[PDB]
Amino acid sequence: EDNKQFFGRHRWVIYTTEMNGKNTFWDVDGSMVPPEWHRWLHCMTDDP
Amino acid sequence: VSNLTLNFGPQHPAAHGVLRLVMELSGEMVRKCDPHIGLLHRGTEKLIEYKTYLQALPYFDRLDYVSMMCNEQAYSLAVEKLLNIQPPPRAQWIRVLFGEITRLLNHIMAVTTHALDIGAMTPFFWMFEEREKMFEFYERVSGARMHAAYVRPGGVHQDLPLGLMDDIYEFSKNFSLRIDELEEMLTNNRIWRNRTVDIGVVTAEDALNYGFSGVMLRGSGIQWDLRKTQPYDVYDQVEFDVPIGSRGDCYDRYLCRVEEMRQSIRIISQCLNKMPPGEIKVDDAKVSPPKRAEMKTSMESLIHHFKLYTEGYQVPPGATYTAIEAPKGEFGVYLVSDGSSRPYRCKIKAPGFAHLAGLDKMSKGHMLADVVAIIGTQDIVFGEVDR
Amino acid sequence: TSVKPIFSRDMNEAKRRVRELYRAWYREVPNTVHLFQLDISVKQGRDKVREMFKKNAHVTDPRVVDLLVIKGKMELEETINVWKQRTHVMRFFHETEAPRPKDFLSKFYVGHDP
Amino acid sequence: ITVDEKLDITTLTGVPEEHIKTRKARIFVPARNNMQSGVNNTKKWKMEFDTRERWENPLMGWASTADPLSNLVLTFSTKEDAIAFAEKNGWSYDVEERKVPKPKSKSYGANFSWNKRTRVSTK
Amino acid sequence: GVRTSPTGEKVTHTGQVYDDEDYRRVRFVGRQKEVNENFAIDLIAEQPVSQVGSRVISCDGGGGALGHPRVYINLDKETKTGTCGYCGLQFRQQH
Amino acid sequence: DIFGREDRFLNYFANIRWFGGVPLISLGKKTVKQPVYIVDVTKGIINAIKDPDARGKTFAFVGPNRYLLFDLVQYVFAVAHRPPWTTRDKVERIHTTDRTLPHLPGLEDLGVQATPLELKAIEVLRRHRTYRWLSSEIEDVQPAK
Amino acid sequence: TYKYVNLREPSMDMKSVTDRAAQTLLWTELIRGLGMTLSYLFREPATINYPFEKGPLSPRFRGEHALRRYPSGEERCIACKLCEAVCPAQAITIEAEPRADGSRRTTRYDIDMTKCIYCGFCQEACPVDAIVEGPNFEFSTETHEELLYNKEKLLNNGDKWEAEIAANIQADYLYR
Amino acid sequence: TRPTVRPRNDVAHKQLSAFGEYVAEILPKYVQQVQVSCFSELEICIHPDGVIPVLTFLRDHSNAQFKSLADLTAVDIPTRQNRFEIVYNLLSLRFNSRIRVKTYTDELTPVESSVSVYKAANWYEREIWDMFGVFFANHPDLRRILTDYGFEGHPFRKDFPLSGYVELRYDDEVKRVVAEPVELAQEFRKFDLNSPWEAFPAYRQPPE
Amino acid sequence: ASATRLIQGLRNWASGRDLQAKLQLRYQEISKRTQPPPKLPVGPSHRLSNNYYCARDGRREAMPPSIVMSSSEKKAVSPAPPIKRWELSQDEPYL
Amino acid sequence: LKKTTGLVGLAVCETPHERLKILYTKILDVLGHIPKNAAYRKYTEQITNEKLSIVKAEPDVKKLEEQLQGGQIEEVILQAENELSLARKMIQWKPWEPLVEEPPASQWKWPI
Amino acid sequence: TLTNKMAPALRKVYDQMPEPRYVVSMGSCANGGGYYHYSYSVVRGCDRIVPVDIYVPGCPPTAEALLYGILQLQKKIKREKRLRIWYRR
Numbered sequence A: 001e002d003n004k005q006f007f008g009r010h011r012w013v014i015y016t017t018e019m020n021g022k023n024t025f026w027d028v029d030g031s032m033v034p035p036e037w038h039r040w041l042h043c044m045t046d047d048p
Numbered sequence B: 001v002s003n004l005t006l007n008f009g010p011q012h013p014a015a016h017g018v019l020r021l022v023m024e025l026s027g028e029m030v031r032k033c034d035p036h037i038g039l040l041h042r043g044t045e046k047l048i049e050y051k052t053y054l055q056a057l058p059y060f061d062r063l064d065y066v067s068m069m070c071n072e073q074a075y076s077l078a079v080e081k082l083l084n085i086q087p088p089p090r091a092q093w094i095r096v097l098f099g100e101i102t103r104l105l106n107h108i109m110a111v112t113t114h115a116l117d118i119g120a121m122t123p124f125f126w127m128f129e130e131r132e133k134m135f136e137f138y139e140r141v142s143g144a145r146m147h148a149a150y151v152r153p154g155g156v157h158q159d160l161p162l163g164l165m166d167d168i169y170e171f172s173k174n175f176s177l178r179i180d181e182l183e184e185m186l187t188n189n190r191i192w193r194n195r196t197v198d199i200g201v202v203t204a205e206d207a208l209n210y211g212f213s214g215v216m217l218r219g220s221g222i223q224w225d226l227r228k229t230q231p232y233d234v235y236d237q238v239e240f241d242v243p244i245g246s247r248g249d250c251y252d253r254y255l256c257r258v259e260e261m262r263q264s265i266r267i268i269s270q271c272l273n274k275m276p277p278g279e280i281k282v283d284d285a286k287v288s289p290p291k292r293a294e295m296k297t298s299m300e301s302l303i304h305h306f307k308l309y310t311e312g313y314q315v316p317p318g319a320t321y322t323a324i325e326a327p328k329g330e331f332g333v334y335l336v337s338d339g340s341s342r343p344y345r346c347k348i349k350a351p352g353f354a355h356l357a358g359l360d361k362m363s364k365g366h367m368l369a370d371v372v373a374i375i376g377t378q379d380i381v382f383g384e385v386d387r
Numbered sequence C: 001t002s003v004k005p006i007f008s009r010d011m012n013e014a015k016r017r018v019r020e021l022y023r024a025w026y027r028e029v030p031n032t033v034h035l036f037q038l039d040i041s042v043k044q045g046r047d048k049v050r051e052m053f054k055k056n057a058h059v060t061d062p063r064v065v066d067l068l069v070i071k072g073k074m075e076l077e078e079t080i081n082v083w084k085q086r087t088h089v090m091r092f093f094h095e096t097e098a099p100r101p102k103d104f105l106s107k108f109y110v111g112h113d114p
Numbered sequence D: 001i002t003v004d005e006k007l008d009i010t011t012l013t014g015v016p017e018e019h020i021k022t023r024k025a026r027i028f029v030p031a032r033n034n035m036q037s038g039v040n041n042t043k044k045w046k047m048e049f050d051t052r053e054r055w056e057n058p059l060m061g062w063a064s065t066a067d068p069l070s071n072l073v074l075t076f077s078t079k080e081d082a083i084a085f086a087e088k089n090g091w092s093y094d095v096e097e098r099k100v101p102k103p104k105s106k107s108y109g110a111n112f113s114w115n116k117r118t119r120v121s122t123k
Numbered sequence E: 001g002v003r004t005s006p007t008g009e010k011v012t013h014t015g016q017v018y019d020d021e022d023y024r025r026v027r028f029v030g031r032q033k034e035v036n037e038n039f040a041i042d043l044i045a046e047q048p049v050s051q052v053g054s055r056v057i058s059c060d061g062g063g064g065a066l067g068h069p070r071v072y073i074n075l076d077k078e079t080k081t082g083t084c085g086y087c088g089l090q091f092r093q094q095h
Numbered sequence F: 001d002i003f004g005r006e007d008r009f010l011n012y013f014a015n016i017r018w019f020g021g022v023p024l025i026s027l028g029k030k031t032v033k034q035p036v037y038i039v040d041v042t043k044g045i046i047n048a049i050k051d052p053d054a055r056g057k058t059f060a061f062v063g064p065n066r067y068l069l070f071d072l073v074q075y076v077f078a079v080a081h082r083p084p085w086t087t088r089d090k091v092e093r094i095h096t097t098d099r100t101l102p103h104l105p106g107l108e109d110l111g112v113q114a115t116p117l118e119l120k121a122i123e124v125l126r127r128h129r130t131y132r133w134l135s136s137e138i139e140d141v142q143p144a145k
Numbered sequence G: 001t002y003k004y005v006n007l008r009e010p011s012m013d014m015k016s017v018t019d020r021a022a023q024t025l026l027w028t029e030l031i032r033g034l035g036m037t038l039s040y041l042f043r044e045p046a047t048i049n050y051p052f053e054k055g056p057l058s059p060r061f062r063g064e065h066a067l068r069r070y071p072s073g074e075e076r077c078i079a080c081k082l083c084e085a086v087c088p089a090q091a092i093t094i095e096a097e098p099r100a101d102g103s104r105r106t107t108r109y110d111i112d113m114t115k116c117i118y119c120g121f122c123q124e125a126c127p128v129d130a131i132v133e134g135p136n137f138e139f140s141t142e143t144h145e146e147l148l149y150n151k152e153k154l155l156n157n158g159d160k161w162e163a164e165i166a167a168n169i170q171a172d173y174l175y176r
Numbered sequence H: 001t002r003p004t005v006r007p008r009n010d011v012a013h014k015q016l017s018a019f020g021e022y023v024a025e026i027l028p029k030y031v032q033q034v035q036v037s038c039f040s041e042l043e044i045c046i047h048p049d050g051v052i053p054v055l056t057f058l059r060d061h062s063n064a065q066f067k068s069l070a071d072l073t074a075v076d077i078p079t080r081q082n083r084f085e086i087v088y089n090l091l092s093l094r095f096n097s098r099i100r101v102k103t104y105t106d107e108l109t110p111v112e113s114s115v116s117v118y119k120a121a122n123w124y125e126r127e128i129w130d131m132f133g134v135f136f137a138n139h140p141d142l143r144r145i146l147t148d149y150g151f152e153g154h155p156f157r158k159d160f161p162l163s164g165y166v167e168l169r170y171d172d173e174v175k176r177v178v179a180e181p182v183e184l185a186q187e188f189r190k191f192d193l194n195s196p197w198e199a200f201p202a203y204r205q206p207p208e
Numbered sequence I: 001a002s003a004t005r006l007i008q009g010l011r012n013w014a015s016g017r018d019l020q021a022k023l024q025l026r027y028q029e030i031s032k033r034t035q036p037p038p039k040l041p042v043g044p045s046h047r048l049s050n051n052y053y054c055a056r057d058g059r060r061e062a063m064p065p066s067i068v069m070s071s072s073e074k075k076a077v078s079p080a081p082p083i084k085r086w087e088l089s090q091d092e093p094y095l
Numbered sequence J: 001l002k003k004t005t006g007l008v009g010l011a012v013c014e015t016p017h018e019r020l021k022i023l024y025t026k027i028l029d030v031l032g033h034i035p036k037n038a039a040y041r042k043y044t045e046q047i048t049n050e051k052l053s054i055v056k057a058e059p060d061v062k063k064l065e066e067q068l069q070g071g072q073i074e075e076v077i078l079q080a081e082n083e084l085s086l087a088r089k090m091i092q093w094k095p096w097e098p099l100v101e102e103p104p105a106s107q108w109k110w111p112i
Numbered sequence K: 001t002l003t004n005k006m007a008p009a010l011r012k013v014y015d016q017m018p019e020p021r022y023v024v025s026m027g028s029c030a031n032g033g034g035y036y037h038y039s040y041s042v043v044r045g046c047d048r049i050v051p052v053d054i055y056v057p058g059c060p061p062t063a064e065a066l067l068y069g070i071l072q073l074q075k076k077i078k079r080e081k082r083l084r085i086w087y088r089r
């Protein structure tokens, strides 16, 4: 989460690897975020 | 013999909707053009007959998709008018606000895409960024991006989320600066101007017979407006002024769209200043559903909920024609109601369906390379024309 | 019983106009079947044309006849030009309609009250 | 104008496919749904069609058909208009006769009457 | 750990299990047959039997404005457990 | 030999015309052949599949009329005019000659119509300059038929 | 009121037409104005990296169709048919057989996400708020099959995230 | 009645009644029924002849202008000896008013060329022909708008079901799009939403 | 904006004055999210003792009156007085 | 004097007065050639004489436009033209004769 | 929305294309009929015309969602493994 320097690109993520004991890195896409981080990452709510 | 028969093309990179076209021409000059419309025709008016008023409303959203809250306002005003209801004041004000916001949308689109079609790859980008801010507003308001209704008969529902009008204000603050940036991007450009100057002019009475209603009549003489003459809601009160032009030249129509964007900024401003905190929906439980707190715990609210969804409110019989000012010009729906839940026969009026019928005369005097600009100049969506 | 007849007062001029129309079709069958590059022999196409005329042969009222003639000159007015692709002109022919059994115990044998 | 007076039955071939021969059309006045009491559903003649088969779709099982005319209904004011539209529009029809409640005499006092067998127990 | 068919299919909280004859079963070849592993009914008997020292009680079903609408259920008959029509969670009057 | 749009037979003959001009007819004649159009075949299969008493009965398909000699090659080469494989496996394949044995249920014994070569041949061939329908002068070998 | 443009007197007087021959001839307005207002380039563009960053949204946003259940899950759906009754695309299916306990739930509750226009009406009509439009837009199936949802898939969708939806509903129920 | 109800004005009501009455006085030939909606929109019924004369009038006469044609449409009503109501809906430019002109026809009886007054009527008439099938005498052109070229049957009229009688698909047999009798995956479930009790007492008709 | 020196002089020198609300909208003024939870008013009616639904109904009217229906030179009155012509706007007469 | 009128396709004629005089006298002649009962001649002749007198009064151009209540003078002239055309077109096909056949008499009841 | 009238032209546009090609169906309409799926002129799905790979629902699908669809198409391109089966092993 950025210092708030700017909107729209507020916050950002790295998905890393091994999720569900399946795939690998380089496969990054959506749905890698769990539900609550989906909420707070989309500007839905300002509270992590 | 000579002449030719040429045809359309499937898309420009920004293309909204596809027409065919058959132009019998002379050497690089079009003597006769005969647009084939009806290519994309989804048969809404037959569908609406099978679905109740509350159900058929998204059709009135997406028949003309670009300008949306306006069409919403048209159908809603129709059902209210025929149904003898008035929305509470705050509903009317919100409806005006998003009405002129939507007008800002459809105008900025029409202008920019009119550039991208002709050349000028960039202004499309600069301004549709701001348009993305606009949909950033809708997503808060109605809970979805574009087609989300947020308009009913008997007033809008689900009032603004707390803290929205701040964002509205903030966009409206510097939008003036940015649209002026477009005005330096164009308007004294020798290229764009010298491409569209005298192309596709119109005589005022001729426009009346051909039934053009919109920036057409605006930019060509014949001073007229529905907003001023037949105020359909509190949109009467706020002060502003419409532009005109004396050259009927298709350049006037452009500049008139611009100045209507600016005036739209005025109306948005004054609206933000005048907003009463009354309520959202009307208070009549049988026209519009109760909020859940009253729904639960109270019997009659529950019943009117359940039936008002299953069967839907019944509208007394009558024939109405309502007309509003939509960014493509005069838009309207003619409702025909058997005393019932469902409607019966409702034909929308597409300004594009009129304006498009004018290419025959308008394009008679200029070769096809500017028939491009002739089509694109009058705001038109082939999703709205067909229906 | 009053009426506002269209192009003809009596079935006479009706028969006249439909004769005209069939002349037009029998003119332009080869030009089209060659024009859209159909696989049908001109003879076959013409036979389907006269068939489509024969289907309606039992009509009497010359209002109806005249209106059907308007339909005909309208569709022919679309085929004389290119406005209709290979698709529809083929769509008069039915290749992809499965043959429908018209004999009883075959119908009964399958369709269960068609 | 030269109105050209003409006498023949009106028929239409400018309308859809061979369904006209096979299907019979039904005319009636729908009888009140009994589980409610009220007549406003009644008073208007209707036209619906002989129904046709429906099956369980192997992917889901929604009902499905080729019966384009299945879901139509046409409200008429008087039966003469039903037979008129059936004749004119070309496909065969069958009429059902309209029925009404039979006029009755209910006297509340007859609940309590002296020698008459009618008496309301519990009221 | 759902009850499993002799074929290996997992029956559902409304038993849908296909029959060995049915060809449609082939659509599950190579791809999973999805069913919620947590049944509903199994969570009804999970709940305790609430008791109230009053005669007639309410259920919002999880609090105001979120839940099912109010209904007052009658506990008069104590030889059975009076059940809400929405939640399904029983009530009794204590003795 | 099965005949159709994307098939490997008649299209092959259309594409063998290239350099050297020696597809076959080394010794000439000696080749009787009756290509059959594809939809007749596949309709054969579907009737065979949905019709009882098609089980346990072996039989073959026949080009109904044509039963051509190598005059085919110059025909299909004549119509449609003019613009990794294998050895005598392939050219001896296409050079194989017979209609074999008459008694086997041919076609109608499975109850389906047969298609002569001409029209469908036009359809699949296409090519040329496309601008003249003309005639094309059907081969009509039917030797000894 | 009417405020009109382009009706003006171009001055054919001197010192206007000076700058008119300069204007036509030397392209100053074109060059200066346009080339410079593009040389406006340096402002940091607005672009967002979608895998690693995501644009803004709203608590009322409409995702995919998760069913919900009570605490101690009851299958909050009562089967009352409303969500199916108001569906403007008609795409829903409900068949409800009273189950073992005597309470009523649905046997087959289906959706065609193809047909679904994502109204929000089925979110308003549900008396108990059984079905709610999800926050997550998670999609791009490889077959037209996969976009049709059983009651089961909708449940599992509801289990995958709730406290999500619980946060949204708990936020906005004051508006509805 | 003060809140929640549209306030109605009697000024426009009396005015429009006066104007329609006036039209009835000056055109006794074609005028049949002149009524005013209680929400104040004047609506005039016209015999299916004087459409050309009546509209030539309503474009001129200097006490009325109606320079602009708003929209042209029709409504398909069975039960009537004439199926259709051709509805001319006009816009008065000078006076701020709109009035409607209703005319009727059956299938066979044409309506004659409203083009010669309003150019805007050009496509509205064609669209009516294609989507309904009301023929228009000596229209400058008649073609198909909003439907397929080979398409047939005039869809909007209630004789024509929601879906069509055909569908499109493609198959490697013919290498072209084809047509087959309509087959739906889902039945288009039908609903009866009409409740009894006559919610509106005013509009009731006398029973017989 | 981000730290800019001499390029923001370029931009100040091309297109004129700027830096109020950088086009990107990225600097604060985001309202947080709902510091108070919303609570909404309720308009007319929603009150006992004032009203009966008959008075405030507003539907159930308007049977359209028919005139001249077939079944003192006066004034030749128009539909209404014409539109009083518009006037200019003192803010900008022209632009 | 003035300048190009606001309307795009309309000429500016420096002689409005006697132009209107001519046109209105024409409308009196032709409009008077109609049999005199029918309301059309009555009302049209009334308004025509009235507005004519309005022309007989104010000499100036602008205040004439003001009190006249029409549009800009050119628009008024045009509308007088169309008035005349409608007049003679109205001499043809005799609009004032009694009704042509009444409707089916069951037709116009809306609610069905 | 894909109407009957447009459909043939659509398949032609498909039909002159580089042989390796992919079709992404966007929007509830084209992906199986969407808000219409009924009446007549509209074709139901774009499968009935051309084969399809990535169905992205939404009405309209949020630009982010469409983009996620294109990315998932890329991840279908990864596993093509098209050539080593031309090696037939």
Ligand SMILES: CCCCCCCCCCCCCCCCCC(=O)OC[C@H](COP(=O)(O)OCCN)OC(=O)CCCCCCCCCCCCCCCCC
Residues within 6 Å of the ligand: B190, B194, G024, G025, G026, G027, G031
């Ligand atoms: C003292 C001793 C004697 C000294 C004598 C000295 C005399 C000097 C007098 C001036 C000299 C010439 C100045 C330049 C003239 C170039 C040609 C020209 O004038 O073009 C103008 C012309 C006008 O367009 P238009 O109005 O449509 O045409 C009129 C036709 N009736 O066309 C146009 O305006 C349109 C052209 C648009 C081209 C596309 C846009 C180009 C944008 C970039 C241009 C600048 C590039 C600079 C160079 C880059 C680095 C090399």
Ligand code: SF4
Residues within 6 Å of the ligand: G083, G086, G087, G088, G089, G090, G091, G092, G111, G115, G116, G117, G118, G119, G120, G121, G122, G123
């Ligand atoms: S959002 Fe989808 S399921 Fe819900 S009512 Fe609309 S189309 Fe139906």
Ligand code: SF4
Residues within 6 Å of the ligand: G076, G077, G078, G079, G080, G081, G082, G083, G084, G094, G125, G126, G127, G128, G129, G130, G131
């Ligand atoms: S409205 Fe809610 S409880 Fe009723 S059937 Fe639909 S999902 Fe179930």
Ligand code: SF4
Residues within 6 Å of the ligand: B062, B147, K001, K026, K027, K028, K029, K030, K034, K035, K058, K059, K060, K061
């Ligand atoms: S936004 Fe919705 S209605 Fe429009 S084309 Fe896309 S799916 Fe269809």
Ligand SMILES: [Zn+2]
Residues within 6 Å of the ligand: E059, E060, E061, E068, E084, E085, E086, E087, E088, E089
């Ligand atoms: Zn409960």
